[PDB]
């Protein structure tokens, strides 16, 4: 039995590992740079969480775990090193944690779609009553602790291909959503090391599911999914307000109809990768499809934060920060909400943006999280109705609440709090 100190315990990754250790009866506590929903959540469980970082937050741990972001001048790390307490890195510790688990492993990695795909896998395994241990890089309400759940079945987790060390894992099954290799910083900016990393994890995995259209990684798959090419393919897709349907072909033959409560074309691809994995493992797909149909999504991946049915008003949260992610988000907003007014409140993240937001009816841009006016400027140039609001607390206030309108609060940062405040405003308003 050990006492573990988590430096950066407020992150989605770290809180999962902390919760797991907490679930295993270890003395757990940690610290974080800022307060987060995880720090709030973990405190409610009775875990001491100290914000901000200070060597004051030392309680003679047997072990200290840190995220790649924790710098060597972090006072906690300095104390730990001087106190000679062993310090470990999140991923590396996680791998060791799996080694201890000695369980069947379902890993999902990739540039995009990774967290939702992982949530889908976890959701299927839970539906099939396989009671999996889940480590999610996002929040799924069906999970006992949101981004984590302890079970005695297999373990499902997300592997971040940002850290080259992901290639050191060797799960039973691995879904690789895609691999654009847009963050080679940890691969000495070498697409070759990046490729090698995938090559390597593929070699040590029993079954690899891969995106037939992913230039970099398609050949590694034992089975593939794609739209027009691959083992599992899409013959037809129809998106509607309450759900979207897709006719799936297997090696070219109509094989099944996929129904998802969750919208967006990309979620079909994520569901396809899931189907591919489970079908490949010989699972009766009837319950797998029932589960996929019921999958409720991960917070901030086009999640409905609030809906007023009397007024036909929606507040939706989405992590998008890239022009393409925004073009996609809006395309799915239009598929789901054919006639409603679409209002995007976008907080850019630490040119093409204006063209991506063109599909919205109203755009409010804020300052970047950690220039925003340049986007406003661009929007203004494409000649459409946009606003710039620089102070984050003003965001919810600036908005005109109108019926038949979907308010999409878009961004990877702070914006998530405006969204909640906007909902609270609305509610108190009623």
UniProtKB/Swiss-Prot annotation:
Pathway: Cell wall biogenesis; peptidoglycan biosynthesis
Signal peptide: none
BP GO terms, sorted: cell division; cell wall organization; peptidoglycan biosynthetic process; regulation of cell shape
Residues reported to bind ATP: 110-116
Pfam family, one: Mur_ligase_M
HAMAP family given in the database record: MurC
PANTHER family in alphabetical order: UDP-N-ACETYLMURAMATE--L-ALANINE LIGASE (PTHR43445:SF3), UDP-N-ACETYLMURAMATE--L-ALANINE LIGASE-RELATED (PTHR43445)
UniProt protein name: UDP-N-acetylmuramate--L-alanine ligase
Gene: murC
């Amino acid at each position: 039995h050990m006492k573990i100190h988590f430096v950066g315990i407020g992150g989605i990754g770290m809180s999962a590992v902390a919760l797991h250790e907490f679930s295993n009866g270890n003395d757990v506590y940690g610290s974080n740079i800022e307060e987060t929903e995880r720090t709030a959540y973990l405190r409610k469980l009775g875990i001491p969480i100290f914000v901000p970082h200070s060597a004051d937050n030392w309680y003679d741990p047997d072990l200290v775990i840190k995220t790649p972001a924790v710098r060597d001048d972090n006072p906690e790390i300095v104390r730990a090193r001087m106190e000679r307490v062993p310090i470990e890195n999140r991923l590396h510790y996680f791998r060791d944690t799996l080694k201890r688990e000695k369980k069947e492993e379902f890993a999902v990695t990739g540039t995009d779609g990774k967290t939702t795909t992982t949530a889908m896998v976890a959701h299927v395994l839970k539906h099939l009553r396989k009671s999996p241990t889940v480590f999610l890089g996002g929040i799924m309400d069906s999970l006992e602790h949101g981004n984590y759940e302890k079970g005695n079945g297999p373990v499902v987790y997300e592997l971040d291909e940002s850290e080259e060390f992901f290639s050191e894992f060797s799960p039973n099954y691995l879904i690789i959503t895609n691999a654009r290799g847009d963050h080679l910083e940890n691969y000495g900016n070498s697409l070759t090391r990046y490729r090698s990393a995938f090559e390597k994890i593929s070699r040590n995995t029993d079954l690899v599911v891969t995106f037939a259209e992913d230039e970099l990684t398609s050949h590694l798959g034992d089975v593939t999914f794609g739209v027009k090419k691959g083992t599992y393919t899409l013959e037809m897709r129809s998106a509607s307000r309450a759900e979207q349907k897709a006719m799936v072909e297997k090696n070219g033959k109509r094989y099944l109809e996929l129904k998802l409560k969750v919208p967006g074309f990309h979620n079909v691809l994520n569901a396809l990768a899931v189907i591919a994995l489970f079908d490949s493992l010989g699972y009766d797909l009837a319950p797998v499809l029932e589960a996929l149909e019921e999958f409720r999504g991960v917070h901030r991946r086009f999640s409905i934060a609030f809906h007023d049915p009397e007024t036909n008003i929606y507040v939706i949260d989405d992590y998008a920060h890239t022009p393409d992610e925004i073009r996609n988000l809006l395309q799915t907003a239009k598929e789901v909400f054919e006639n409603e007014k679409i209002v995007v409140i976008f907080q850019p993240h630490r040119g093409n943006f204006a063209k991506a937001l063109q599909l919205a009816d109203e755009v409010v841009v804020t300052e970047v999280y950690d220039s925003g006016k340049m986007i406003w400027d661009s929007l203004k140039s494409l000649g459409k109705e946009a606003y710039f609001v620089e102070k984050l607390p003003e965001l919810e206030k600036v908005i005109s609440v109108s019926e038949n309108t979907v308010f999409l609060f878009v961004g990877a940062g702070d914006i998530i709090y405006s969204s909640r405040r906007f909902v609270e405003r609305y509610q108190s308003s009623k």
